[PDB]
Amino acid sequence: ESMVPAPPQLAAKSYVLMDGESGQVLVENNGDQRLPPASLTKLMTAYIATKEIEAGRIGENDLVTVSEHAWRTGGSRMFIKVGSQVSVSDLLHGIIIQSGNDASVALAEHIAGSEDAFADMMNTTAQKLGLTNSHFMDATGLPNPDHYSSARDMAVLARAIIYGEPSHYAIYAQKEFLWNNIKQPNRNLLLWRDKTVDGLKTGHTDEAGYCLVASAVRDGQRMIAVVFGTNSEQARAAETQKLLTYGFRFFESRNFYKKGTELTKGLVWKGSEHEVKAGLAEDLTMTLPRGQMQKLQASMVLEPQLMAPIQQGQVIGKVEVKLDDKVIRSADLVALNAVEEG
Numbered sequence: 001e002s003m004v005p006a007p008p009q010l011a012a013k014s015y016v017l018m019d020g021e022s023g024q025v026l027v028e029n030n031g032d033q034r035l036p037p038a039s040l041t042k043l044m045t046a047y048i049a050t051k052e053i054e055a056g057r058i059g060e061n062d063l064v065t066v067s068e069h070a071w072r073t074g075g076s077r078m079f080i081k082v083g084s085q086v087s088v089s090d091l092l093h094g095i096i097i098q099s100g101n102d103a104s105v106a107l108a109e110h111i112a113g114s115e116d117a118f119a120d121m122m123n124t125t126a127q128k129l130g131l132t133n134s135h136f137m138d139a140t141g142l143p144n145p146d147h148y149s150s151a152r153d154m155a156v157l158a159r160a161i162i163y164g165e166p167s168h169y170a171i172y173a174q175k176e177f178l179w180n181n182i183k184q185p186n187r188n189l190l191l192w193r194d195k196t197v198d199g200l201k202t203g204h205t206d207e208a209g210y211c212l213v214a215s216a217v218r219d220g221q222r223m224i225a226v227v228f229g230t231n232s233e234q235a236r237a238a239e240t241q242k243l244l245t246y247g248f249r250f251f252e253s254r255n256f257y258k259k260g261t262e263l264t265k266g267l268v269w270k271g272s273e274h275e276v277k278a279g280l281a282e283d284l285t286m287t288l289p290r291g292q293m294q295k296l297q298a299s300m301v302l303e304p305q306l307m308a309p310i311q312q313g314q315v316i317g318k319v320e321v322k323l324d325d326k327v328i329r330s331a332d333l334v335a336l337n338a339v340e341e342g
Contacts, residue, residue, distance in 0.1 A: 004289040005250065010243060013033070013035060014150065015027070015151050015227040016031050016152050017246065018159065019221070021283070033133070036143055038141045039187070042099050042141065043200060045108060050161075061088070066086060079182050095107065096174075105140065119137055132153065134157075158213050158224050161200065162200075162215055173191060190240070196216040198216070210232060214244070221247075252293065258283050263333070268310055273339050277336045277337060280331055281332065300333065301317055309338075316335050
C-alpha cells in the first residue's frame with residue numbers, strides 16, 4: 001500500500017532507533033548482539049547513582065573519599081586527587097561529561113563499597129530494566145569477555161535516563177567540566193554539531209569501533225539512536241543522523257491514554273470492595289509509520305481469578321493493541337485503589 005521507505009542501511013555492526021514517548025523500537029539491526037560497550041558502560045554507572053539519589057540513599061552534596069584504586073585508573077579521567085573528598089554531584093559530572101574512569105570508580109565504591117559489588121547492582125539493575133543482552137564486570141567498561149551490552153539494551157537504558165530527573169539529564173548536554181585545573185569538553189561531539197541533540201554518550205575501542213547513544217528532539221518528538229561499531233567519528237555522526245532523520249520524517253506519534261484514568265473494572269475475590277478500577281502506570285502513546293494509526297484497535301483483558309488483598313500498582317491484567325488482528329504494543333493494567341480482605 002502506502003508503506004514508507006525502508007530504513008537506511010548503515011555502515012555499522014548494530015543499531016536501533018527507538019521513539020522516546022512510546023519506547024517502541026522503530027528500526028533494529030543486529031539489535032541483540034552482545035558487543036563491548038566501552039564508555040557506554042558509564043550510562044549504567046551514572047543511572048544507578050541518579051536512582052540512589054532519588055531514593056535518598058545518597059545525597060548530591062555527600063563527600064566521597066577518593067581511593068587509590070579510583071586514582072589508579074587510566075584513560076579519560078576527571079583527575080580527582082587520591083585521598084581528597086569530592087562531592088557526589090561533581091563526580092557525576094565527571095562521569096557524564098568527561099567519561100571519567102576515576103570518578104566512575106570512586107562513585108561506584110561510594111555507593112556499593114567496592115567496584116565488584118557495584119557491578120552486581122549494575123546487573124540487578126539490568127534485570128530490573130529488562131535488559132536481555134547486557135552484563136557488567138566493572139563500572140568503566142574495561143574490555144572483558146563477560147562485559148557486554150547490545151544496541152537495544154542501550155536504547156532501553158538511555159530511555160530510562162532521559163526520562164529521569166531533568167536536572168540530572170541536563171548534565172548530558174553540558175559542554176564542559178572543570179576539575180583540578182583541567183577543563184575538558186563533553187566527549188559527545190554531536191552536541192556542538194546539532195542543536196536538537198541533548199545526549200548521551202560515545203564509546204570506542206579498536207575492537208568495538210566507534211559507538212554512540214544519541215537522543216534528539218524535533219517538532220515535539222524524541223528519537224533515540226544507538227549505533228555500535230562505525231568506522232570513524234565522521235561516519236558515527238553521519239550514520240546516526242541518517243537514522244534520526246528516518247525516525248522523524250517517517251513516523252508519527254499519537255497519545256491514546258494518560259496514566260491513571262480508569263479503562264475498565266475487575267472482579268476481586270475476598271475484598272471489601274467488590275471490584276477495582278484498572279488503569280495504566282503511565283501515558284500510553286503509539287509511534288508508527290504515517291497512515292498506520294488508523295489500523296489500530298485495543299483489547300483490555302483482566303485476570304479471571306485475581307484474589308485479594310490487592311495493592312495499588314499491583315499487576316492485575318494487560319492491555320493489548322492489535323494492528324489488523326496482530327498484537328503489538330502490550331502495556332500493564334494495574335489496580336489504582338488498593339483493596340482489603342474484610
